[PDB]
Ligand binder design. Structure first.
Ligand code: ADP
Ligand code: ADP
Ligand code: MG
Ligand code: MG
Lengths: 443, 445
């Protein structure tokens, strides 16, 4: 039952985030590192750290035998996967169980139900969750796509069933463009995911991307920790997230929370997970996918809820019950800005040595970063510097706090997206909540 | 409104200047900083809307130069001054001069400040208000012979205290009559040098006391709220090193009566702005007023984390003529602890001035490091040994102690010594964990 020692099978800011909660709980925190990451701050803080191989970027971190051997030599009885890397690898999950190591996440069955995005939609339909009109599972091929697109009506979006990170999608405005887009997406999908299965849905114009954080336990209870608006996106990837999503009235908010809970219970979900929805102009909402793991932006939900999500993940893995939904109080407003080592206009990576680093601080300011003065950022591989998160009593106060915090973040030696975020905090469209997932594309 | 403040000069330095600046700017007001030449390297000067050099340095001397401070406010067109703590924050002449120059002093009236400033007269004011005080002299002692007579009357041990006293200075505990005359003159001389006023008073010396204080804020309508109580009993030289809220020593009935007493006291003196009533609590859990600080205190962040209130924000609103939130709206939750990290040796507490060659502060959920330091900053430990205040909050005391240890562990400072290891040994000290200590604990150990 009780977990005594947890190996963090990840790197960067999430490794440090996890380590803090693990050590506060009085458990051993075991870190792993490629040779390229021997300079990582969290290694100084870990109970033990194991070098798991050569840099080659993610390679060693994806080396299942090395991760397992590290857990075993360090005597870890559980593994925290974070996000990315092995967190959605079903093979890894089964191998953990084979070695009597607790995987802190959902069952391989639940993960498998939601891993093919086209099949996941069919599971959601069965469960009474609204989905976007489109293909019934995967497209057979380009001719099937042509027939269907005419039936649902343009514009449509082709999406990779094995897709993630915003890749393998193509919005198609007219039939003349369809076949070319199909093969473009299919090829990218094959290269990125080793699987070129495609599906299709209606393209919602100017949608809001609003997601519900859930956690389920071994007793079948599932709670939500509010919803997040992540509509400020470039290249279908998030830059700024916030909670609550003030776009929603309380009734729609309630319906959305309920839908997420219902969905989690229908699939026997345990652990932290997120249901992602698109919300249209008349506040209709549609499931687009579930992430069966923690997400990068989770801290915004922690700030409004008072919950340590990683603590609850660990407790659930130990067989404890979650708190009751009634005990969960959502208050105020949280915003997160992802600070990356990239130019604030071009968003091109800016690798190099940080020669000055002064993070912001203050009341209800949480800078989540593994960076420090003199640290070298490998922006070509991980451009993440840190997540700057604030909380305040309402959205306007949160924006003002973010502006001060961004102003006080002093980084020299590399370019960062600090100025991008500062310009967003002053942008009347952001202030008035008049934007959507395509806002940056047309500005 | 007509009283809305647009620009605030921060008449202070160090960590409190940065703390104030953050709130002022978040409220959309201009933050004007001042600095002596020795403080040209201060971090908050980078963040200020404007920064004025007010003098060579001496130490506090330029910061204590009223004409220089007023002139800086006027050149910068500040309409209000935030005094922080120390320096001019309890200087009644400065408060009156602000009013003469049509600059709003963010703090109480000079009348309320004057009622409390002489600690012996303050006790008489409190008695009249129905607030319990420690038995002792009725106002100031006439001299050493009066002290001898009184000490037999109230009973040994007694403590001689400077009426103008502060910062733990000008006090002597007297356990027997043979020691009294010498102690009297030692305190009186120290008080004369430190405060320019050797007026002494006496009260009973409470055995093994706990120091528990109540944060209040009053507005111009006569409303006064409290923001909970803080236990600050882990002291060296009668000065605080660790503070927390709530004070788990107290049961609910006593805590309620303590909060009420502070509100009653503040209303009786017409107090507006932030202030703190300091009490000692004895072995029977009876509490007694010892003094009021008519200003913000160093450890205010402790009360912010349990209450969700920005105290400096409320001070500013009150100064603009707004009403405070209702007491009903103030919810006190969880437990917060603050450790004062200074540039001193953890064992000897001797200053360790010098350049910080590495600085990595802790962070994380509900961890607040209040510091103006940065890598390459030189700490003048001889003058201000403060590095920063590390504050954490959690759902209960043991969880807060666990979070404090993790945060202290992750604080990396090189180039100077700090009291980090002292605080780590306090978080691991079973007497601390078990709540079995008092203001003299460190002296016995
Ligand atoms: N049907 C759709 N209509 C409009 N935009 C969409 C649609 N599906 C996805 N998107 C855009 O792509 C983003 C991510 O989609 P998702 O299906 O979650 O992809 P991934 O698995 O790569 O994260 C959404 O936030 C939205 O910006
Ligand atoms: N009557 C007393 N009995 C015991 N200790 C006292 C008494 N008065 C003061 N002290 C000690 O001195 C500390 C500060 O007292 P205070 O009167 O607030 O001095 P200051 O004005 O210097 O802050 C207390 O926290 C306590 O440790
Ligand atoms: Mg997605
Ligand atoms: Mg005092």
């Amino acid at each position: 039952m009780e977990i005594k020692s947890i190996l963090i099978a990840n790197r960067g800011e999430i490794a440090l985030r996890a380590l803090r909660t693990i050590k506060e709980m009085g458990k051993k925190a075991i870190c792993v590192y490629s040779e390229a990451d021997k300079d990582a701050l969290y290694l100084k803080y870990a109970d033990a750290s194991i070098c798991i191989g050569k840099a080659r970027s993610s390679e060693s971190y994806l080396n299942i035998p090395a991760i397992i051997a590290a857990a075993e030599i360090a005597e870890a009885d559980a593994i925290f996967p974070g996000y990315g890397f092995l967190s959605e690898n079903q093979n890894f999950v089964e191998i953990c169980a084979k070695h009597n190591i607790k995987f802190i996440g959902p069952s391989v069955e639940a993960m498998n139900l939601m891993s093919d995005k086209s099949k996941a939609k069919q599971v959601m339909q069965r469960a009474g969750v609204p989905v976007i009109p489109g293909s019934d599972g995967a497209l057979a091929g380009a001719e099937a796509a042509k027939k269907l697109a005419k039936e649902i009506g343009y514009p449509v979006i082709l999406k990779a069933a094995a897709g993630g990170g915003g890749r393998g999608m193509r919005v198609v405005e007219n039939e003349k463009d369809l076949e070319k887009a199909y093969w473009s997406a299919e090829s990218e999908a094959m290269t990125a995911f080793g699987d070129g299965t495609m599906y299709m849905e209606k393209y919602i114009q100017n949608p809001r991307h609003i997601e519900v954080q859930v956690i389920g336990d071994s007793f079948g209870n599932v709670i939500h920790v509010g919803e997040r608006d992540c509509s400020m996106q470039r290249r279908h990837q998030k830059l700024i997230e916030e909670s609550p999503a003030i776009l929603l009235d309380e009734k729609t908010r309630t319906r959305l929370h309920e839908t997420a809970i219902k969905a989690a219970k229908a699939i026997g979900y345990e652990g932290a997970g997120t249901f992602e929805f698109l919300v249209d102009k008349n506040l209709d909402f549609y499931f687009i996918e579930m992430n069966t793991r923690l997400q990068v932006e989770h801290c915004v939900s922690e700030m409004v809820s008072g919950i340590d999500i990683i603590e609850q993940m660990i407790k659930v893995a130990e067989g404890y019950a979650l708190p009751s939904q009634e005990s969960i109080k959502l208050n105020g407003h949280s915003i997160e800005c992802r600070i990356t080592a990239e130019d604030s206009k071009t968003f091109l990576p800016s690798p190099g040595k940080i020669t000055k680093y002064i993070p912001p601080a203050g009341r209800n300011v949480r800078m989540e970063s593994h960076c420090y003065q003199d640290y070298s950022v490998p922006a070509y591989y991980d451009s993440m510097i840190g997540k700057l998160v604030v909380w305040a009593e309402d959205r306007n106060k949160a924006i003002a706090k973010m502006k001060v915090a961004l102003d006080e973040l002093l980084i020299s030696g590399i370019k960062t997206t600090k100025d991008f975020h500062l310009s967003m905090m002053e942008n009347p469209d952001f202030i008035n909540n008049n934007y959507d997932t395509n806002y940056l594309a047309r500005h």
